[PDB]
Design a protein around this ligand. Structure first.
Ligand SMILES: [Zn+2]
Ligand SMILES: [Zn+2]
Ligand SMILES: [Zn+2]
Ligand SMILES: [Zn+2]
Lengths: 223, 223, 223, 223
């Protein structure tokens, strides 16, 4: 079972992917870990990639796509969940052609749907408990609203994290994710639009339902 | 059902208390919220307390204990869980005499047990995920160890929180908690030692078992 | 030369004290360091203090005042600057009587004056540069306003610190500082009111002028 | 007077540039602000750049170099200090040819020199004072070492910032800066090597001397 997952920052995408990967014993493959395996491990592709990174340039798609496929072959032989790549349409189509050339089949593509204003507010609304950072509090998510100014689980003090309040940075990542010309939504839709012809199932998850409700609908449509 | 809960920082005490209060529909009463009700709301006891606080002195026990009892009467009429008070033996005995004078019965006292070195390491070992602060990671808790330097749920970057690394502050709170002469353990033991005579049950939870395992044993011994 | 300095959080008090202590080769004695010398070093007074702290009670004034005087005798024999003690009128008068009993003379008392709303806004207005935390930026201090959303020195990204945004905590410290019944301003005024009789000079610094301008007027009135 | 400045993270580069720009009334032009002027202001080059950024690709040098020159013409007509661009040799040579085509002369190039291990330790050694974040403390810089665990200016508590402790991120920026094949040092040296032929002066600042000492030698060699 091979799955691609898409969703913006603010959509709970890591949480949902973790649940799927545990249930189906999948390798969870994330674009950052691919580079550490190849750039850090000095594979022939990684030594080639690292000459771009070390000038401040990006790695070209003709090196990145073979890296991804090498990792999928190596870590994903009993099934994989690919998270965070592709980000744009050129990458999505190069990835699809590379997977076909190696006979590697996509079985599911999952997209978590959330309006961009909702996604941004969910990130900025997070409040961290001083006593235990695991305690979920979010001023913009009714089911886990704080108890006034304090933690709804234990009554500890709450604070905001500066990176969650950095609106210029949140907006530049959502700019790319929500770009339906050639950004990540256009990439997700390129897969949606060929699912029926290519024999895979495209699953749309409504990101506004609860952690439990989303997990139920998802684990039902893969089962 | 009236319950007192004790445990050091690093023992998961808020999490466990929240579970108990939800299961039994208890008011969760924490020492900080008592002051906001009385100091903030200008009760006669609160206006009296606030003259000490405003000089930098502590509120005397002859004002704090009546505050606690007024809150228990007011917010806790259908059952309460009192968390974070008493902290020492003088408070514990004044509280017991005040509860007897008002005919308010203790039904359970819960103590979460953890060695102090274990408690400190659990606090300092916490690592927060950049992508989602809910994702539990802890270098000192094997079941939720990170995946190398990254989040074990989603592969996001991890960082430490400065307050979790502040060893002088952690040690001064554990100094008080673990003081068996007249600190919080001596207070917990004052209750343990009269449980049989006073007709309440003293529950000891081994804080090194999992969130699930502790919750099972606890919810079993209250049931 | 012996000096007491008073000022609220938000008044630049540490900066000014450091300048005075360097110019006059004074020991800078701060209430926190007194405890580490005595509580940490197990002086007879410190072992006595630590039994209160370890129950969660404050150290009584009849132990704290002798501690302060022992430190002044020991670290301050060639002149001292005492910062952060006394905080209330009872401490201020006990300190004055203890200094007289040991023949230790006050030469100057410095008070940095700022309206409380100004002090709070100066704390909340601080913005820290990502590239270098030394670069001063403050949305509420015109001379060091940021350059739009970025550092006015180097153009780096700016963020806020959670403790600078914690209005409940800022307000509880200003509650004590600005309490003119028996809090820290009442303590400062107790000294002001006896300066002429006791042969010391009381210096009032207008905390709204620049770091340079305040330093000039101050170093002039001590010279 | 037109100046290019180079230095790694950890070298005090913003501080020194600010001093030069104030003394000579220069526009301080930093690579981040160029994009906000063009990408944010929708110049014809900026609308072109933003189509790459919105796919997650970099802006090509044939768009970035004209952007830089347009900003230099517009904001830098009475003299500029260009900070943070170029980062590699291809950019450095394209920039030089673009400046020649517009008749814009370089007068000085400043390089702040520090060994990479020294630069990393200066970043990781920073400690921020709780009372005032302006107070410089650094465990790796002897002149501003803390006073034990506390602020050397005011005795306040010290903490570390997570981004200053992120060694993978520090190393990836130093990887590019210290790359003498085609990274930022190779770019700086491309200018050094033509200074005499092109009639500009290349200034090397020893980054291990004090803020004052560096500023003196620098302001002397520009004067
Ligand atoms: Zn909490
Ligand atoms: Zn995570
Ligand atoms: Zn800066
Ligand atoms: Zn300081």
């Amino acid at each position: 079972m091979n799955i691609l997952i898409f969703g913006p920052n603010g959509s709970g995408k890591g949480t949902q992917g973790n649940l799927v990967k545990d249930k189906y014993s999948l390798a969870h493959i994330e674009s950052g870990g691919i580079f550490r395996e190849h750039i850090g491990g000095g594979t022939e592709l990684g030594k080639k990639a690292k000459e771009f990174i070390d000038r401040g340039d990006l790695v070209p798609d003709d090196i990145t796509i073979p890296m991804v496929l090498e990792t999928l072959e190596s870590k994903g032989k009993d099934g994989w969940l690919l998270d965070g790549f592709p980000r744009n349409t050129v990458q999505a189509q190069k990835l699809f052609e590379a997977l076909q050339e190696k006979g590697m089949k996509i079985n599911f593509v999952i997209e978590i749907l959330l309006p961009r204003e909702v996604a941004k507010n969910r990130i900025m609304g997070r409040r961290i408990c001083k006593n235990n950072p695991n305690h979920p509090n979010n001023i913009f998510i009714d089911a886990i609203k704080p108890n006034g100014d304090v933690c709804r689980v234990c009554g500890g003090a709450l604070s905001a994290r500066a990176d969650d309040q950095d609106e210029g940075a949140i907006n530049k990542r959502h700019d790319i994710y929500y770009n339906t010309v050639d950004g990540t939504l256009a990439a997700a839709y390129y897969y949606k639009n060929m699912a029926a012809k290519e024999g895979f199932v495209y699953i749309e998850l409504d990101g506004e339902g609860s952690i439990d409700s989303i997990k139920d609908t998802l684990l039902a449509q893969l089962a």
